[PDB]
Design a protein around this nucleic acid. Structure first.
Lengths: 62, 62
DNA sequence: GAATTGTGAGCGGATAACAATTT
DNA sequence: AAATTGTTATCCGCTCACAATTC
């Protein structure tokens, strides 16, 4: 898989796989650090949403 | 517009979603009778095969 | 035993729901 | 009960295998 996935972001930032989604949805059940951690990992990983599965799961963005 | 699915096709064709994909895939273990009735349903509802899904379920298909 | 066909697990990711724990 | 974080299954559309069916 050439494009990065939310799963890579979760693992990299060192959080649960729900945390990453949680941060993406800007949920209230998320601490500041955790939110910044996942958002940062998006840079290192060069996270580029999996348009294939993402559309299937909803949309090619959010 | 509204996205259609192999299920809408299956429902309108009165077949199983698998049957639809068997027709879409155009492989063996498929009778010509079902092929034409499923292909017909895709025209009705305007079914567009998700190449990203086909890639999700099919490893290195395209 | 194979063509037909249905049911389901799976891929791959995102979300909903839920559970342990602590407050 | 709710917050945090984690855990699990489901769901999306699609594909393949297997089981059951029928001949």
């Amino acid at each position: 898989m050439k494009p990065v996935t939310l799963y890579d972001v979760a693992e990299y930032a060192g959080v649960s796989y729900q945390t990453v989604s949680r941060v993406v949805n800007q949920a209230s059940h998320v601490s500041a650090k955790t939110r910044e951690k996942v958002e940062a990992a998006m840079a290192e990983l060069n996270y580029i949403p999996n348009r294939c599965a993402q559309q299937l799961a909803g949309k090619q963005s959010l």
